[PDB]
Amino acid sequence: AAQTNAPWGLARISSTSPGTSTYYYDESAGQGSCVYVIDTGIEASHPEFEGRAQMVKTYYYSSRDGNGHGTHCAGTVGSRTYGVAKKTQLFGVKVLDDNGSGQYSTIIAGMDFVASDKNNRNCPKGVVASLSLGGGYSSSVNSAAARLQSSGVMVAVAAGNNNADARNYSPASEPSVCTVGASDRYDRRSSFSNYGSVLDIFGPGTDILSTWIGGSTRSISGTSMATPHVAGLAAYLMTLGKTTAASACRYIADTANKGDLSNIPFGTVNLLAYNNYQA
Ligand SMILES: COC(=O)c1ccc(C[NH3+])cc1
């Protein structure tokens, strides 16, 4: 399938070159997979989700996304226009309040929730979790992400936006999950993207158009925006039968566009997420 005039990041993930605007992907489109978006919530009523999004858990007085961040990330995973995996099922877990903040104890509970809740969902092609959040190093946060991954969920986490080594941030620093840095439309490392040995992959993260609350759209930047590109890609590849939750990060790294990004510090992988779809 070909989506013309796609957001640059979608075009980038199906291209061997920057500077194109059509997204090419297998029509299976993540059908039969599920992606949990662990964030500020999801505005499931947005027409862009086509009834494929739902809130499954909140730790606050509402499950609604009063912020927008979670809706934007969910849109990059799976919205009809802005999403990588246009037929996946999206499950929202609201661990962050409407200001975008959340206690680590709530975030940990949300991860353990997903590890169990997937057994209440129909995801025959596999389960992914997208975590566009983080803070300072915490062994407990890292352990929760490791448990979620161990339980059979492909966990993708943001590297962070500190222009620093991700070793000092969690869950970015957990080795067993997929830690995602951000790039721009010119194949440069995003100016804010963390780096370091713990990164597994880069995805589009600067000026990413997606869904927003109030039935709207907007373009924002962050490793929060790169992470759902990788989560959606994992769901797409799992539906194709090319990889599994346990191996999807390594598969994405192995099949990535290699050596094409600029301003990647020595010791950080130079790997850009790529679907290898041959139309
Ligand atoms: C240190 O000057 C740079 O910004 C830089 C230029 C090219 C590369 C190789 N991709 C890495 C870094």
UniProtKB/Swiss-Prot annotation:
Question: Start and end of every Peptidase S8 domain?
Answer: 7-279
What reaction does this enzyme carry out catalytically? Answer: Hydrolysis of keratin, and of other proteins with subtilisin-like specificity. Hydrolyzes peptide amides
- Keyword set includes ATP-binding: no
Q: List cellular component terms (GO).
A: extracellular region
Q: Write down the required cofactor(s).
A: Ca(2+)
- In the Enzyme Commission scheme, what number(s) does this protein have? 3.4.21.64
Q: Has UniProt tagged this entry with the keyword Ribonucleoprotein?
A: no
The GO molecular function terms of this record are:
metal ion binding; serine-type endopeptidase activity
- Entry keyword set: Calcium, Disulfide bond, Hydrolase, Metal-binding, Protease, Serine protease, Signal, Zymogen
Task: Tell me the active site.
Answer: 39, 69, 224
Give the cofactor binding note.
Binds 2 calcium ions per subunit.
Detail which positions bind Ca(2+) 2: 16, 260
Q: Which domain of life is it from?
A: Eukaryota
Residues that hold Ca(2+) 1 according to the record: 175, 177, 200
Enzyme class at the top of the EC tree: hydrolase
Disulfide connectivity for this sequence is: 34-123, 178-249
Q: Which GO terms describe its biological process?
A: proteolysis
Function as written in the Swiss-Prot or TrEMBL entry: Hydrolyzes keratin at aromatic and hydrophobic residues.
Say which family it is in.
Answer: Belongs to the peptidase S8 family.
**What protein name does the entry list?**
Proteinase K
> What lineage is on file?
Eukaryota, Fungi, Dikarya, Ascomycota, Pezizomycotina
Point out the gene that encodes the protein: PROK
Specify first residue, last residue and whole-protein length for the fragment.
Answer: 106 to 384 of 384
